[PDB]
């Protein structure tokens, strides 16, 4: 069974992008004058967590206008219900992820058939697609297909300025290859190894200051919060950090097409 999250404390990341995750499950909160858009929904056991956090910070649950998220597996997803239930969030979703998100997962190319990976069925509000924004009160969000992980999963960038300095934000969505996914003649997902290379190339090509990602142990988030709280001039600007993870995972995707090709 997956490992249930414990508490993170919420904290300001740059500008108007918040943390308001888990200390594993990474969910962001970003504040606009016209309301607030949230990223993950994590686990059903994390949305009071997630209200809680929110409100900590002083802002309203009831304010959340946009729910996404990074890709469709229950540990990024499975509270979209009981969020849109409560806030009446419009959920919007990459094209490629949506029928998982409308079967709950009983559509995945991989968990189709593994009733533990099951999540509260939605309907998605809006039906996003590569390179697509999505804007509130003058921020913009960019939807980058990023596939492999899921068939759509989704690295969101934004543009941030603090201390008077611009900065591109990456929230890496995934580009892990999970335990026993098949990349060589794949039966449901032929394409997979094809979309992972894809994914690699946009990544490594990618402007990248601002290091996030949808799992808090991809960016060093409890490292870096240490830094926060310690004064330090922003560690969640982590350029170097950002290109070193990538060039990780595409040589860990090689590493394991080496694996199903050849061992
Ligand atoms: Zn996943
Ligand atoms: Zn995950």
Redesign the pocket.
Known sequence: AYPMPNPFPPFRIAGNLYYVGTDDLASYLIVTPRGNILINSDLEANVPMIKASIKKLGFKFSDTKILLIS?A?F??AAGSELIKQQTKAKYMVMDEDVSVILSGGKSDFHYANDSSTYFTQSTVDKVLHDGERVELGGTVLTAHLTPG??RGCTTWTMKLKDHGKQYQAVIIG?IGV?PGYKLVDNITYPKIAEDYKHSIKVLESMRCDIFLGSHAGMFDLKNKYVLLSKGQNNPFVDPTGCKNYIEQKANDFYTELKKQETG
């Open positions: 890709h597996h540990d990024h992980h899921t995934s999970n």
